[PDB]
Write a protein that binds this ligand. Structure first.
Ligand SMILES: [Cl-]
Ligand SMILES: [Cl-]
Ligand SMILES: [Cl-]
Lengths: 163, 7
């Protein structure tokens, strides 16, 4: 099977190769941003798109190029043609609105509450947790790796098991 | 039923 693009979240000129799994917020937190200190007037850059994937919560969003999208045979490529058209007719044509939008997008990566846990645990003893995301409805809850959730949202785990 | 993004 293949991945499917749900929504184009953002666009940037970023460091060549700063795409894929190393760009999730949790890979950035563990190993540093692959795009850190990028200055488009000092080194090779490429147009990168921030992708929200179908069936994966916002913590799994990754930066991708049209090349990486085509190489991984992702579905929803019609949205790329659509986003590129929309992006071009914005540059031709706000900063408080883009800032507000960005803060919102950051909230979708925050666990508000844990509402279920798996009976099975990993070898490291972590169950998976069903997460309610800040600023998103319950229809957007998702199962997540307990080891990943414990890194930043231990307080949500503690609240869930305190009940 | 969780997953992580892996290279
Ligand atoms: Cl253990
Ligand atoms: Cl543990
Ligand atoms: Cl409980």
């Amino acid at each position: 099977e293949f991945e499917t693009i749900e929504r184009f979240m953002d666009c940037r000129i970023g460091r060549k190769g700063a795409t894929g799994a190393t760009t999730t917020i949790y890979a950035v937190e563990a190993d540093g941003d692959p795009n850190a200190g990028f200055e488009k007037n000092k080194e090779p850059g490429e147009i990168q798109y921030l992708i929200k994937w179908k069936g994966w919560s916002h913590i799994h969003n990754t930066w991708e190029t049209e090349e990486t999208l085509k190489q991984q045979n992702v579905r929803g490529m019609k949205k790329l043609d659509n986003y590129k058209k929309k992006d071009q007719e914005t540059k031709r044509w706000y900063n408080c609105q883009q800032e507000l939008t960005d803060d919102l997008h950051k909230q979708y990566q925050i666990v508000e509450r844990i509402i279920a846990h798996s009976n099975q645990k990993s070898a490291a003893g972590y169950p998976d947790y069903y997460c309610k995301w800040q600023g998103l409805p319950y229809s957007e809850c998702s199962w997540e790796d307990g080891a990943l959730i414990s890194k930043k949202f231990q307080a949500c785990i503690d609240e869930y098991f305190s009940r | 039923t969780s997953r992580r993004k892996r290279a």
